[PDB]
Design a protein around this ligand. Sequence first.
Ligand SMILES: O=C(O)[C@H]1O[C@@H](O[C@H]2[C@H](O)[C@H](O)[C@H](O)O[C@@H]2C(=O)O)[C@@H](O)[C@@H](O)[C@@H]1O
Length: 226
Amino acid sequence: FYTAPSTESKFTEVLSKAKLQYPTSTTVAFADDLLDGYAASYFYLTSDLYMQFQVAGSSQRSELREMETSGDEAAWDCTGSTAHVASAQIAIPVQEDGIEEVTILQVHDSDVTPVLRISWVSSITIDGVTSEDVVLATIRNGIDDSTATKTVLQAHTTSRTEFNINVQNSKLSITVDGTTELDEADISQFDGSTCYFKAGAFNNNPTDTSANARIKMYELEWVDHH
Ligand SMILES: O=C(O)[C@H]1O[C@@H](O[C@H]2[C@H](O)[C@H](O)[C@H](O)O[C@@H]2C(=O)O)[C@@H](O)[C@@H](O)[C@@H]1O
């Protein structure tokens, strides 16, 4: 009794270029599975046509991982001259009690390091400034450095919001509803790495391991160019 996101043509291309991971890193549905009507409590189309991801547990995820239509995994040069762009229209609902951070978009390297996470956070303190209920960009400072540079992008709203990630020439930019909120952040620390996009709900440090994080996407696409 779940409608598949594949029933909406606006998702055909991204699903053809994705695989779904749930609840950890193992793939539960490949592109062909997704295109053939895959749907479950953790991944389904709502009545008003959002692709909704839902998951409970610490560091558990319901997440799409960028793929090539060939079936190759996406593995583009993180710092190369070819622009890689991810665009999404995301409605972040008020999260259930005990949900503290939910990652909704990533640039991830082809090993174990997220280059960028865009996440909702209940709270965050950056250089002495605490912000409540915001959308955050987190860029890891290196593969061998567990620390990250964090940037507030937006006050959380339930309204559908346009996010754009543009990666090119060792820099990364983020726009929110068309306004630049992170302007050519350096990611040269991933020279020599390959990268891919992810999108969905990835539940970070919940205080209630039973609560469900929940994220809705009205549009989603990832492209490259030159
Ligand atoms: O909480 C920390 O100690 C560090 O977490 C970092 O983000 C994590 C994130 O919580 C997820 O587990 C993800 O899978 O891996 C990320 C990682 O880079 O290890 C950063 O938030 C960092 O600022 C924290 O120091």
